[PDB]
C-alpha cells in the first residue's frame, strides 16, 4: 500500500523482472513487465485495473494516477532500481522522440532489463514517466521514452 518505488519479482529462484511506482494506492508499471498478471503484496493481491499495450503501461487497484510531464528544458532523474542494487538516482537531460503525434521526452540511459518500470522524476520529485520502452540507434545505444499515461 505505501507510496514508493518497488521491485517486481517473479518466482526455482527469484528474479527481478521490473520496477513500478505505488502512488495514491495504485501500482503503476509497464505492461511488458507483468503482462497484466496479478501481483502479490504481502498477503494481499493487486489486480490489474487498466492496461494499454500500445502505451506499454498498466495500473493495479485503480486508474493510472501519474500525470506530471517533462517541461522540455530541465534535467530529470531516473530513479533506477537495478536487480541486486539499491535504488539510485541518475540525472540526465532528456533528448526527444519526435512523432507524428508530438514530442516525447527520452532518456539515453542503458540499465539492465529488470529496471523497466523505474520512475523518471522532475525536480519536484513528481513522476513524469516510466523507463524501459524505447529504441536502439546504433550498436546497443538504447534510448528509453519517458512513458507517461493519462489520469
Amino acid at each position: 500500500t505505501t507510496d514508493g518505488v518497488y521491485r517486481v519479482m517473479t518466482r526455482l529462484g527469484s528474479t527481478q523482472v521490473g520496477v513500478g511506482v505505488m502512488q495514491e494506492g495504485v501500482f503503476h508499471t509497464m505492461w511488458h513487465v507483468t503482462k497484466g498478471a496479478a501481483l502479490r503484496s504481502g498477503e494481499g493481491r493487486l489486480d490489474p485495473y487498466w492496461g494499454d499495450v500500445k502505451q506499454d503501461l498498466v495500473s493495479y487497484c485503480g486508474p493510472w494516477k501519474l500525470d506530471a510531464a517533462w517541461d522540455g528544458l530541465s534535467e530529470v532523474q531516473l530513479l533506477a532500481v537495478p536487480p541486486g542494487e539499491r535504488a539510485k538516482n541518475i540525472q540526465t537531460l532528456p533528448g526527444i522522440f519526435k512523432t507524428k503525434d508530438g514530442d516525447i521526452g527520452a532518456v539515453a540511459l542503458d540499465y539492465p532489463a529488470g529496471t523497466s518500470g523505474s520512475p523518471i522524476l522532475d525536480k519536484s520529485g513528481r513522476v513524469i514517466g516510466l523507463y524501459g520502452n524505447g529504441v536502439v540507434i546504433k550498436n546497443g545505444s538504447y534510448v528509453s521514452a519517458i512513458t507517461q499515461g493519462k489520469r
Binding site: 514508493g4 518497488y6 503484496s41 532523474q77 541518475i90 540525472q91 503525434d101 540511459l109 520502452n133 529504441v135
Partner: protein, 39 residues
C-alpha cells in the same frame, strides 16, 4: 508467482550522478507499442 518489494522513496536526490546524451530522434510508434526510427 509475481510479487513486489519496496525499494525506496520517490525523491529527487540533490547532487546525483549525471550522465547520458540527449539525442533528438524521429520515431514511429506502432500498435504493439514498438518504437522504431524513421528517416
Amino acid at each position: 508467482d509475481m510479487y513486489i518489494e519496496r525499494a525506496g522513496d520517490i525523491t529527487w536526490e540533490k547532487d546525483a550522478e549525471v550522465t547520458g546524451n540527449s539525442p533528438r530522434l524521429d520515431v514511429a510508434l506502432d500498435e504493439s507499442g514498438d518504437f522504431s526510427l524513421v528517416e
